[PDB]
Design a protein around this ligand. Structure first.
Ligand SMILES: [K+]
Lengths: 355, 81, 290, 36
C-alpha cells in the first residue's frame, strides 16, 4: 500500500512538473511557470490532504485540467482503499497482554465463574474501607469478555483490579498472569447451573491444571456438591495442611440453617462474625444501637502463653474473659495419635498443653 | 485407591481428546508446560491414547497407501474383505 | 553562526554514548540501584514531590522559551549580567541530576537511552552548557520541553484531582495533542527564522512563534488560508512530514475518540415532575398490543 | 582553533558523567549510613 501511494504521488508530481514547465502548446509555450520537481511534490501533498495553501498552484490550462483529474482520482482511490485501511488498523484486543509484576505488591488470581454477583460480593468484602492497609492486587482471568456493567465495575476499581482474557487450562495464559508469583488462586463456582456435577468436575480440573503448573501455590475453591470434594484428595499436590481449602456452599448453607433450627439467630451471628461491617454510631435508644455494638466483633487465632499450661479450659477462659476481655471459644488439641482436632469448649477434665 | 498395596501400579489406558491434557494424567512428571505430546511421560509410557494421532495417519496415508493396509491387518485382528 | 556546535554537542552526547554502551554490552551496585529506584518510585512521597517539581520546572522553562522566542535566534549575553540565563541553567542542572538518578536506577541502559525524557535532556542541557561556555545564546530545541506536558495527567493523579478513568484518558489525550502542537510549532519557528544553511541563511522569514502555532492549527484542520506559510525548503519538507504524521496519528486515535464519545443511553435519566399534572406509572409486560 | 572546539564537543558528555558519578557517590554514602 505504501509503495503504491508513493509511486502514484511521484508520477503525478512528474506529470505536473512536465506540463507546467513546458507550457501550453497552443499559446506558443508562453505559459511556462518555473517550478522545480520538489515544489510539484509539495503541491501534490498539499492538494491530496485537502489543505490548499495556494502559494504554489497550476497556472496552465492543461495543468489545471490534470489537477482536476488528479483530485477526482485521488478521492476515488482513497474511498476504494478505506476498507483496507480499516483492516490494517483492525480491532485491537482490549484485554490482551500480561500482568506486570510490581515489587512489594502481592497479587491474587481469581478464576472460575466471573459474573456481576460473585465479583461484586467478593470485591465488596475484600476491598472494604475498614480493612487494614494491605497492598494486594486482584487479577481476574476469564475467557468470556465482560459486559457493560462488569466493565463499569472494573473501572470503579481500576487502581487495584485488573482483568485478563484467557483460560486457566491453557498454561500460556497462566504464565501471562504470573501464576508462579501469585500469593493465592481463588476459584468461584457457578451457583446457577443445570448440572452441579459438571461444574464441580470443571473446577476440580482447573485445580488440577493450576497445581500442575505450580504445585506450591495456595488454592481456595468453591464446591457445589459435598460428595465431589473428595476428588480433591486424589490430587497429590493438594495439601490441606498448607492452606488449600474447599468451601462447600451446600454443606455450609444447610448446616447454618440446621444450627439456626437448633437455636435461631445463629446464622446471623456467624455471618456477622467473619464479615467486615462498617460501624455507625447510633445515639437514639433503638435496637440498632445494641445490635451494632455486637456487629463489630471478629474471630482471631492466637497461641496461648506458657502461663496457661497445666490449667483446665474453663479456668483459662474465665481468666481471659474477666481480665483480658477476650472470649475464647475453641482450642486446637494436637496429639500424635490422631493429628490435630479443634475442640469447641472442652470440659474441665482437659488441660492446656504447650503451644 | 488403596488395597490390602496402592493403585499407582495398576495399568490403565485413558482416551484423550485434547493433547494438552495428557500432562494431567501424571503426578511425578518434571515435564515443562511447553513439552510436546510425544515427549510427555504418559504418551511415552503408553498409558494415554490421544486420538489426534489418527489425524496424522491421514497424511501418512497420502504419501504411502500401503501403511493403512498394514496397520489394519496388524491391529484389527485380520479382518478379511 | 555556530549553531553546529550546539547541535553536535547533543548529537555526540546521544550517539557516541549509545555506541559505547552497546560496545560495553558486547564485551554492591544493586544496593544503590534499589536505593535510587525507591527514591524515584511513584509510590514514594519523595517521588511524588520530585515529579511534581520537575513538571513545574519544565513548565517554567517552557515559559522562559516563550519569552526568549521574541529575541533573535542567535545572540550574545552574559551569565553575570542576565539572571534569567542563570535561572535557566539552574533548571537544566536540576534536570541533569534527575537524569542521573534515573540512569543509576535504570534496569536496561538501551531502553532508558531510547526514551523521550533522555533525548529531550540530551538535546536541551548540552546546548545550555555550550551557551554558557561560549557566552553565546542559541534558541535551539528548547521547545521540546513542551513534551513534558504528556505526563500532566499523572500529576493530577497524584494530587487526587482526577479519579475516574475516563477523565484521565481525556486529559492524557488533550495533553498529547497540545504537546505535539507546540513542539511542531517550535520546529517550524526555528527552521523558518534560521533560514536555509546551504543558501547562506538568506531565506529567513520573520515569523513569531504564535504565528507558527496559528499556521499549525490552520494546517491540521485542513483549512489552509495561505496567509502565512513555509517558504524555506526545509520548512516545507517539515510541513509535509507533519501533515503525513498528523493524518496517521488522527487515524490511529479515531477509535479512542469513538470510545470517549461512547453510546449514550437513550432512555436514561429520571422523570421531571410538573406542578398541576398527575402521572400514572405503567409497568409489567410492555409490548405493542397492550 | 581546536581546543575550544574540543571543549564544546566534550563539555556535555563530561557533565553527564560528572552527574552520574555524583549520584552514584551520594547513593553509596546514603546506603553506607543506612547500613550503619
Ligand atoms: K464483624
Amino acid at each position: 500500500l505504501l509503495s503504491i501511494f508513493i509511486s502514484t504521488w511521484l508520477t503525478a508530481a512528474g506529470f505536473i512538473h512536465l506540463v507546467e514547465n513546458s507550457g501550453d502548446p497552443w499559446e506558443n509555450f508562453q505559459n511556462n511557470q518555473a517550478l522545480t520537481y520538489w515544489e510539484c511534490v509539495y503541491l501534490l501533498m498539499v492538494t491530496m490532504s485537502t489543505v490548499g495553501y495556494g502559494d504554489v498552484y497550476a497556472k496552465t490550462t492543461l495543468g489545471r485540467l490534470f489537477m482536476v483529474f488528479f483530485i477526482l482520482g485521488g478521492l476515488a482511490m482513497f474511498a476504494s482503499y478505506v476498507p483496507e485501511i480499516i483492516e490494517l488498523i483492525g480491532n485491537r484486543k482490549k484485554y490482551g497482554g500480561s500482568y506486570s509484576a510490581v515489587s512489594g505488591r502481592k497479587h491474587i488470581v481469581v478464576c472460575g465463574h466471573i459474573t456481576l454477583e460473585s465479583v461484586s460480593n467478593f470485591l465488596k468484602d475484600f476491598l472494604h474501607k475498614d480493612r487494614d492497609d494491605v497492598n494486594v492486587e486482584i487479577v481476574f482471568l476469564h475467557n468470556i469478555s465482560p459486559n457493560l456493567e462488569l466493565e463499569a465495575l472494573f473501572k470503579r476499581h481500576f487502581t487495584q483490579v485488573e482483568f485478563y482474557q484467557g483460560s486457566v487450562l491453557n498454561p500460556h495464559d497462566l504464565a501471562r498472569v504470573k501464576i508462579e508469583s501469585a500469593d493465592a488462586c481463588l476459584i468461584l463456582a457457578n451457583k446457577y447451573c443445570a448440572d452441579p456435577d459438571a461444574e464441580d468436575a470443571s473446577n476440580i480440573m482447573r485445580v488440577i491444571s493450576i497445581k500442575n503448573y505450580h504445585p506450591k501455590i495456595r488454592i481456595i475453591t468453591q464446591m457445589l456438591q459435598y460428595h465431589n470434594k473428595a476428588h480433591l484428595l486424589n490430587i497429590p499436590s493438594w495439601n490441606w495442611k498448607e492452606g488449600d481449602d474447599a468451601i462447600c456452599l451446600a454443606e455450609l448453607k444447610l448446616g447454618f440453617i440446621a444450627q439456626s433450627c437448633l437455636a435461631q439467630g445463629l446464622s446471623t451471628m456467624l455471618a456477622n462474625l467473619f464479615s467486615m461491617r462498617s460501624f455507625i454510631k447510633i445515639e437514639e435508644d433503638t435496637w440498632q444501637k445494641y445490635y451494632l455494638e455486637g456487629v463489630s466483633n471478629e474471630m482471631y487465632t492466637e497461641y496461648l502463653s506458657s502461663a496457661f499450661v497445666g490449667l483446665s479450659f474453663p479456668t483459662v477462659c474465665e481468666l481471659c474473659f474477666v481480665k483480658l476481655k477476650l472470649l475464647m471459644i475453641a482450642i486446637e488439641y494436637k496429639s500424635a495419635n490422631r493429628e490435630s482436632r479443634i475442640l469447641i469448649n472442652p470440659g474441665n477434665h482437659l488441660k492446656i498443653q504447650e503451644g | 485407591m488403596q488395597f490390602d498395596t496402592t493403585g499407582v501400579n495398576i495399568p490403565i489406558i485413558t482416551e484423550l481428546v485434547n493433547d494438552t491434557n495428557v500432562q494431567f494424567l501424571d503426578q511425578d512428571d518434571d515435564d515443562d508446560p511447553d513439552t510436546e505430546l510425544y515427549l510427555t511421560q504418559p504418551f511415552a509410557c503408553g498409558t494415554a491414547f490421544a486420538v489426534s494421532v489418527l489425524d496424522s495417519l491421514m497424511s501418512a496415508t497420502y504419501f504411502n497407501d500401503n501403511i493403512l493396509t498394514l496397520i489394519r491387518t496388524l491391529v484389527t485382528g485380520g479382518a478379511t474383505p | 553562526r555556530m549553531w553546529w556546535a550546539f547541535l553536535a554537542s547533543s548529537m555526540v552526547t546521544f550517539f557516541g554514548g549509545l555506541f559505547i554502551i552497546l560496545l560495553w554490552r558486547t564485551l554492591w551496585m544493586t544496593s544503590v540501584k534499589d536505593w535510587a529506584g525507591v527514591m524515584i518510585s511513584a509510590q514514594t512521597l519523595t517521588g511524588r514531590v520530585l515529579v511534581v517539581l520537575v513538571f513545574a520546572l519544565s513548565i517554567g522553562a517552557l515559559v522562559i522559551y516563550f519569552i526568549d522566542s521574541s529575541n533573535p535566534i542567535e545572540s550574545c549575553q552574559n551569565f553575570y549580567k542576565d539572571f534569567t540565563l542563570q535561572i535557566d541553567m539552574a533548571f537544566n542542572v536540576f534536570f541533569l541530576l534527575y537524569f542521573g538518578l534515573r540512569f543509576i536506577a535504570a534496569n536496561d541502559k538501551l531502553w532508558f537511552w531510547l526514551e523521550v525524557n533522555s533525548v529531550v535532556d540530551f538535546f536541551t542541557v548540552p546546548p545550555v552548557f555550550v551557551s554558557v561556555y561560549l557566552n553565546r545564546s542559541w534558541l535551539g530545541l528548547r521547545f521540546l520541553r513542551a513534551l513534558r506536558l504528556i505526563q500532566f495527567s499523572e500529576i493530577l493523579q497524584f494530587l487526587n484531582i482526577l479519579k475516574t478513568s475516563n477523565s484521565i484518558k481525556l486529559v492524557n489525550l488533550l495533553s498529547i495533542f497540545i504537546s505535539t502542537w507546540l513542539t511542531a510549532a517550535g520546529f517550524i519557528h526555528l527552521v523558518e527564522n534560521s533560514g536555509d544553511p546551504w543558501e547562506n541563511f538568506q531565506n529567513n522569514q520573520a515569523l513569531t512563534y504564535w504565528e507558527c502555532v496559528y499556521l499549525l492549527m490552520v494546517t491540521m484542520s485542513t483549512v489552509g488560508y495561505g496567509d502565512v506559510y513555509a517558504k524555506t525548503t526545509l520548512g516545507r519538507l517539515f510541513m509535509v512530514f507533519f501533515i503525513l504524521g498528523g493524518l496517521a496519528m488522527f487515524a490511529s486515535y479515531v477509535p479512542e475518540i469513538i470510545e470517549l464519545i461512547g453510546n449514550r443511553k437513550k432512555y436514561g435519566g429520571s422523570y421531571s415532575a410538573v406542578s398541576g399534572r398527575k402521572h400514572i406509572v405503567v409497568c409489567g409486560h410492555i409490548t405493542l398490543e397492550s | 582553533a581546536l581546543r575550544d572546539l574540543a571543549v564544546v564537543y566534550t563539555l556535555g558528555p563530561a557533565s553527564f558523567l560528572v552527574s552520574l558519578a555524583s549520584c552514584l557517590a551520594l547513593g553509596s554514602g546514603l546506603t553506607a549510613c543506612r547500613a550503619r
